[PDB]
Amino acid sequence: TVMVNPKRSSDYYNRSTSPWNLHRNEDPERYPSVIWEAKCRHLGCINADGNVDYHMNSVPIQQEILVLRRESFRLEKILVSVGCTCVTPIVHH
Amino acid sequence: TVMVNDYYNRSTSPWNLHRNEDPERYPSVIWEAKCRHLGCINADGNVDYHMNSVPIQQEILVLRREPPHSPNSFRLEKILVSVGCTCVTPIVHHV
Ligand SMILES: Cc1ccc2ncccc2c1-c1ccc(O)c(C(=O)O)c1
Ligand SMILES: Cc1ccc2ncccc2c1-c1ccc(O)c(C(=O)O)c1
């Protein structure tokens, strides 16, 4: 026991070859109550012609973050998606 | 005041993880991303500067010992962390 005293400001989500949207994650018993989580727009990645390359993969980049939960509060560690990256698939065993 | 109790090696914008350690902080250890290249990896496996690797930055909540060195009193603080990298067009679309 111890004592303790959203925005989208980057355009990377649209300029990325693995672009992403944001989804509202809301929990009234949590601080922050509203978290915006990334969801990749495509299964594949966008090529230089602007079309989807289904061979590559858009995958979410996750971060472990601290949140406060009403329980007087209790500290929790959760995983949130912050954006997406484009990867070459695992193609061997 | 309250009381409290490989995929990136495969990315076209790969990154390496770096230890951010602060004993005055909870969590003490945060693993941050540093993009490996300024370009992105092309289909030949080389760095290509027609596109750029950029680090996605996220504002995260953290506990800071207040007063310093205290084992049971903290202040809520927000810091900017690099979580991973994505591959972007070097151009922007707004004025
Ligand atoms: C990321 C992106 C988004 C929208 C596009 N819309 C039309 C055409 C290309 C687009 C690209 C894109 C992808 C890969 C690339 O290599 C390049 C590039 O080389 O500019 C551009
Ligand atoms: C991401 C990645 C990582 C390592 C590689 N090492 C050798 C060759 C290509 C590599 C690729 C890569 C990049 C873009 C791509 O478009 C493709 C692909 O289309 O296969 C593959």
Numbering used by the authors:
A (entry chain A): 44 to 48, 60 to 125, 132 to 153
B (entry chain B): 44 to 48, 65 to 154
What does the study report here?
The Interleukin 17 (IL17) family comprises several structurally-related dimeric cytokines that are elicited by infection and other immunological stimuli. The preeminent family member is IL17A3, which forms homodimers and can also heterodimerize with IL17F. IL17 proteins drive and amplify inflammatory responses in a wide variety of cells including keratinocytes, fibroblasts and lymphocytes. Here we present a new class of inhibitor molecules that interact with IL17A at a novel C-terminal binding site.
In addition to Cmpd 5, we also identified a salicylate fragment (Cmpd 7) as a binder to the C-terminal site in IL17A. We solved the co-crystal structure of this compound, and it also displayed two copies that overlaid very nicely with the position of Cmpd 6. Interestingly, one copy of Cmpd 7 was observed to make a water-mediated interaction with His109 through its carboxylic acid moeity (in the analogous position as Cmpd 6’s pyridine). That same water molecule appeared to be further stabilized by Thr148 and the carboxylic acid moiety also utilized another water molecule to engage Asp107. The first was to merge aspects of the quinoline fragment with salicylate fragment by swapping the central pyridyl ring for a benzoic acid to productively engage His109, Thr148, and Asp107 (as seen in the salicylate fragment, Cmpd 7). From this observation and by comparison to another salicylate fragment (Cmpd 7) that we found also bound in this region, we were able to “link” the two copies into a larger molecule.
